[PDB]
Enzyme design. Sequence first.
Site, mmCIF file in Angstrom:
data_model
loop_
_atom_site.group_PDB
_atom_site.id
_atom_site.type_symbol
_atom_site.label_atom_id
_atom_site.label_comp_id
_atom_site.label_asym_id
_atom_site.label_seq_id
_atom_site.Cartn_x
_atom_site.Cartn_y
_atom_site.Cartn_z
ATOM 1 N N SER A 177 0.794 -1.215 0.000
ATOM 2 C CA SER A 177 0.000 0.000 0.000
ATOM 3 C C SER A 177 0.828 1.266 0.000
ATOM 4 O O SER A 177 0.429 2.292 -0.524
ATOM 5 C CB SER A 177 -0.914 0.000 1.226
ATOM 6 O OG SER A 177 -1.992 -0.888 0.947
ATOM 7 N N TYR B 118 1.595 3.306 -3.110
ATOM 8 C CA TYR B 118 0.585 4.172 -3.671
ATOM 9 C C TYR B 118 0.444 5.473 -2.943
ATOM 10 O O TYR B 118 -0.389 6.274 -3.335
ATOM 11 C CB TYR B 118 -0.777 3.461 -3.698
ATOM 12 C CG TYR B 118 -0.713 2.210 -4.502
ATOM 13 C CD1 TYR B 118 -0.949 2.245 -5.873
ATOM 14 C CD2 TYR B 118 -0.339 1.026 -3.936
ATOM 15 C CE1 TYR B 118 -0.877 1.080 -6.649
ATOM 16 C CE2 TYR B 118 -0.251 -0.142 -4.696
ATOM 17 C CZ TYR B 118 -0.535 -0.099 -6.049
ATOM 18 O OH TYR B 118 -0.394 -1.255 -6.770
ATOM 19 N N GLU C 227 -3.267 -8.592 -3.188
ATOM 20 C CA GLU C 227 -4.201 -7.504 -3.352
ATOM 21 C C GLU C 227 -5.576 -8.064 -3.004
ATOM 22 O O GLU C 227 -6.013 -9.087 -3.597
ATOM 23 C CB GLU C 227 -4.220 -6.943 -4.778
ATOM 24 C CG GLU C 227 -2.759 -6.577 -5.288
ATOM 25 C CD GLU C 227 -2.696 -5.820 -6.563
ATOM 26 O OE1 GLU C 227 -3.751 -5.378 -7.093
ATOM 27 O OE2 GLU C 227 -1.538 -5.612 -7.052
HETATM 28 C C1 LIG Z 1 -6.549 6.379 -8.724
HETATM 29 C C2 LIG Z 1 -6.889 6.424 -7.222
HETATM 30 N N1 LIG Z 1 -6.680 5.066 -6.650
HETATM 31 C C3 LIG Z 1 -6.247 4.910 -5.401
HETATM 32 O O1 LIG Z 1 -6.101 5.820 -4.589
HETATM 33 C C4 LIG Z 1 -6.017 3.468 -4.961
HETATM 34 C C5 LIG Z 1 -4.536 3.316 -4.610
HETATM 35 C C6 LIG Z 1 -4.199 1.949 -4.132
HETATM 36 N N2 LIG Z 1 -4.104 0.915 -4.986
HETATM 37 C C7 LIG Z 1 -3.798 -0.315 -4.475
HETATM 38 C C8 LIG Z 1 -3.698 -1.390 -5.380
HETATM 39 C C9 LIG Z 1 -3.363 -2.646 -4.903
HETATM 40 C C10 LIG Z 1 -3.125 -2.818 -3.538
HETATM 41 C C11 LIG Z 1 -3.190 -1.750 -2.614
HETATM 42 C C12 LIG Z 1 -3.556 -0.516 -3.108
HETATM 43 C C13 LIG Z 1 -3.598 0.584 -2.254
HETATM 44 O O2 LIG Z 1 -3.347 0.518 -1.047
HETATM 45 N N3 LIG Z 1 -3.949 1.804 -2.810
HETATM 46 C C14 LIG Z 1 -8.315 6.838 -7.031
HETATM 47 C C15 LIG Z 1 -9.404 5.958 -7.200
HETATM 48 C C16 LIG Z 1 -10.715 6.406 -7.013
HETATM 49 C C17 LIG Z 1 -10.945 7.733 -6.629
HETATM 50 C C18 LIG Z 1 -9.867 8.555 -6.467
HETATM 51 C C19 LIG Z 1 -8.567 8.157 -6.652
#
Ligand SMILES: C[C@H](NC(=O)CCc1nc2ccccc2c(=O)[nH]1)c1ccccc1
Length: 357
Positions: free
Chosen positions: A247, A250, A339
């Site tokens: 995590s 990100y 994930e």
């Molecule tokens: C593009 C952004 N996505 C994220 O914030 C998710 C980030 C995230 N991805 C992961 C993928 C696999 C495993 C863990 C994570 C994670 O902790 N965060 C987003 C998604 C929807 C609304 C606003 C922003």
Amino acid sequence: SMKRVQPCSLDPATQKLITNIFSKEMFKNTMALMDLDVKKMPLGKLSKQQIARGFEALEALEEALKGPTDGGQSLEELSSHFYTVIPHNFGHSQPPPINSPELLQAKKDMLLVLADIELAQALQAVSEQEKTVEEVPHPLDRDYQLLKCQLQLLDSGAPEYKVIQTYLEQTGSNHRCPTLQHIWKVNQEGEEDRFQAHSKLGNRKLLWHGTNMAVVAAILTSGLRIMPHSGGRVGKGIYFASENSKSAGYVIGMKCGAHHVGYMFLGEVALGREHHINTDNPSLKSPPPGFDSVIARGHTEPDPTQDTELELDGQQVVVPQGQPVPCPEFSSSTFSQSEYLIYQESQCRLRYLLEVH
Ligand SMILES: C[C@H](NC(=O)CCc1nc2ccccc2c(=O)[nH]1)c1ccccc1
């Protein structure tokens, strides 16, 4: 006459958080990091219409990438339209064509972030009630109130503090683990009710969710969301990790003074009956029938023999406490680290927010 500004009710750590998640500098930094032209797209000018027009342009690219060649507009022409709608800056050279699935999803993700920036701006619009009252809250109280989300700063000896710290330390990077600064308990109500609906599901786990600082205010107001253009290696859901280090990849943080400040969530996820996968499937939109979640299983997992539980609203919630160990069944998985996916927003409720340096 001049309005009284009431003294701020917030502790110093909460004031800093609130300052950071609504910071115009932060938002513009984020737009620069995503190659946006902040001169052509000032925060005040961002609009829901522009963002929708942006997704429409990406929808046309997606169709061109999949379904022709059939005499539609070229990827260059369609890209050019997108860049007119959503101005980019590449040192005033021409932006590049959106000619791969990877780049298409990257632009969709950029717009999802930008949509949450615009949400934050829209949230801060001054109401007529506020123009008429003769005293106003401190700006930080006003911003905190806009979230309609209770944040309670924990101290060292809160029942869950050591459990959370252990989860971070044991599953974070081995060489340079994020340093824990603060933990807040998060209570976004009106999350409570839809979450109750999964009270039957026994298999609850507290999982990491890392994000851009620019979307923290949006998440606090509205929870973790699945949007029409959400995607990734396990399709259109909400992504979590059991390993902080996953995590943490990100987390988009910001330099403040001599430090790098970032925020991470812990959500309680009602996983129910798990479907395990060992290869990417970007096409997923729900678990298979009879299942409540999809877990893309990693080569490692925090050692399950060290799991503990926390009692949250009278439900036992599993919290890993172990360092990652190999899982032989998944040693050939396409995923290094797991994930965890849900495909209904109701299956997650936010529980904690962590500031890490
Ligand atoms: C593009 C952004 N996505 C994220 O914030 C998710 C980030 C995230 N991805 C992961 C993928 C696999 C495993 C863990 C994570 C994670 O902790 N965060 C987003 C998604 C929807 C609304 C606003 C922003």
